């Protein structure tokens, strides 16, 4: 992790990263219409390192609703509590306070 | 990009990453209830290097609708008039050369006039 070098909007790798950013946004979007890149204003790149963690973990539903301390929310009880087996992929860089969830894949289990 | 080493479910850094993962899923999830971690089965860690790109860019709505995917935005003309919408977005993209793909990490898009 170093400080970002400024780049040319026309840099071919910048353009590759732009196209990727658009594609993922459109997959994410809540618009029916696809979106397209017009102009690229500011482009910067940083060099980065981090650890990627690969978790397989079981999670249970608590009773608390979303509209925060999860320790104080006790799990649901019996057939009412739904359990999940999830494979997570988390990325931690030393600079960020945050860590990012990259891929997650969850599946329900039987009683 | 290196090999995953298996680690202890109780490793404090593993615990911090589980905590992070849960929070992220909870914001993402389509459940009404928050979820909580019970048991940690398998934990592995991999070392990673790549470049992060920080784009600020303007995007327009095209006429192509949604009803990976097989899209050439080159073939999709921007909208005219009623369907017009312009966005100014700050993206953060991560590219690792070992992997082929790139990942969008943070995006913040804002409508324009």
Residue numbers in the entry:
A (entry chain B): 10 to 76, 83 to 126
B (entry chain A): 10 to 76, 80 to 125
Question: What does the original paper state about this entry?
Answer:
Cystatins are inhibitors specifically controlling the activity of cysteine proteases. The cystatin superfamily shares a common fold that is characterized by a 5-stranded antiparallel β-sheet that is enwrapping a central α-helix. Because of its strict specificity for cleaving after asparagine residues, it is synonymously referred to as the asparaginyl-endopeptidase (AEP)2 (15, 16). This strict preference is exploited by the legumain-inhibitory cystatins C, E, and F, which use a conserved Asn39 residue, localized on a reactive center loop different from the papain-inhibitory site to specifically bind to the legumain active site. Cystatin E is the most potent physiologic legumain inhibitor, binding 100-fold more tightly as compared with cystatin C. Thereby, it is associated with a tumor suppressor function in prostate cancer, melanoma, and oral carcinoma cells.
From a structural perspective, the hCE dimer was assembled from two hCE monomer conformers that are connected via their L1 loops. Analysis with PDBePISA and PDBsum revealed that the hCE dimer interface is built up by 45 hydrogen bonds, 361 nonbonded contacts, and two charge-driven interactions. This results in a buried surface area of the dimer interface of 6710 Å2 and an interface area of ∼3354 Å2. Furthermore, the free energy of complex dissociation, ΔGdiss, of 55.4 kcal/m indicates that the dimer is thermodynamically stable. Remarkably, we discovered the assembly of two hCE dimers to a tetramer. Nevertheless, the overall assembly (nearly parallel β2-β3 strands) is similar between stefin B, cystatin C, and cystatin E and therefore suggests a conserved mechanism of oligomerization. The dimers interact via hydrophobic contacts involving residues of the former L1 loops. Despite this large structural rearrangement, the local conformations of the legumain RCL and LEL were virtually identical in monomeric and dimeric hCE structures. The crystal structure of dimeric hCE uncovered two symmetric and functional legumain-binding sites, either of which is accessible for legumain binding. Upon dimerization, the L1 loop, which is essential for binding to the papain S1′ site, was incorporated into the newly formed βII-βIII sheet. Thus, loop L1 is not available for binding anymore, and the papain-inhibitory site is destroyed by the dimer interface.
